[model samples]
Target: SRKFIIANARVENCAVIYCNDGFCELCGYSRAEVMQRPCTCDFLHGPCTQRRAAAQIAQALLGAEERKVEIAFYRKDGSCFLCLVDVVPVKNEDGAVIMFILNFEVVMEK
Candidate 1:
């Protein structure tokens, strides 16, 4: 079942201002610190298909995209992790992507 929208995420980066979320313990830092960075780190442990994230961004910019796949992204602690991310480009009145909105469900392995 689906949980809350934007509720399951560990916001390491703010989609609003483009800043990174600090580390977390459940993943590595305190929630306070995590909230601080907000959206800049790009959060990865092993490797990222930058092209994938980029493609989503490109499509998002054009107001045409959806993140239905689960991406293997990195965690704050430099460990491999999996995330179910939903990417819906935040479009303006003219359908221009102003801010990218991502909803994620992260599952870290021990």
Candidate 2:
């Protein structure tokens, strides 16, 4: 089993069109509030409280089809913690990179 992922899970997925229910619950933010966000990077910038890792994730996302990175995120109450982020690229039938699927898991350093 992967240590990055604990028992059970907290997950979320987002697209240019709409965000998943998990995303709204994960951040303690309303769907309307979260819906204003276009991509995972937006949350990473404002809610996550980390820009270096967010930029890294964004940069990697631009080139790679899919990748995972460890980063920290801030909660709605301003609480923050380290976590693992799995960024998967969702493709269209024409093989165009359309949207992204982001998976998250709280993690600790070894």
Candidate 3:
């Protein structure tokens, strides 16, 4: 199966509002478990993750810029994987960013 995860989060708080089944499955978490949780770079980051990549992700999110970066992400089971992460700002009719759509592609499984 194609390993991809998608999530939508509110820009204000960067909290997950919606997540696809692949997000739950790939992250080893249930919808009920992650709903309303903070969806920041640190959400999936772990000791093995690179700080520079994490910082880049955070900067992109806060700057409301579309960005793609490859970084290590940890699953709920304490295992990790390398992922190609893409984030896009979702703007409302007022031209203000209201949410973010994040896509995750598994590059290397642990």
Q: Which candidate gets the maximum TM-score versus the true structure?
A: 3
- Against the true structure, candidate 2 has what lDDT? 0.56
- The superposed Cα distance between candidate 1 and the true structure at residue 9, in angstroms, equals 20
lDDT of each: 0.45, 0.56, 0.77
Q: What does candidate 3's lDDT look like per residue over 5-83, in tens digits?
A: 3335444558777777888888888888777776663667898899898888888888888999899999988999998
Ranking by lDDT: 3, 2, 1
Off by over 4 Å in 2: 1-16, 44-51, 108-110
Which stretches of candidate 3 lie above 4 Å from their native place?
1-12
Per-prediction TM-score to the true structure, in the order listed: 0.49, 0.66, 0.84
Q: Count the backbone clashes (under 3 Å) in each candidate.
A: 18, 0, 0
For candidate 2, list the clashing residue pairs, or say none.
none
Q: Is candidate 1 or candidate 2 better by lDDT?
A: 2
- Give the CA lDDT, 0 to 100, for residue 64 in model 2: 42
Q: Estimate, for each residue in 37-108, the C-alpha lDDT of model 2 and write its tens digit.
A: 445535534454467777666765565447777777766766676767787776679776655666676685
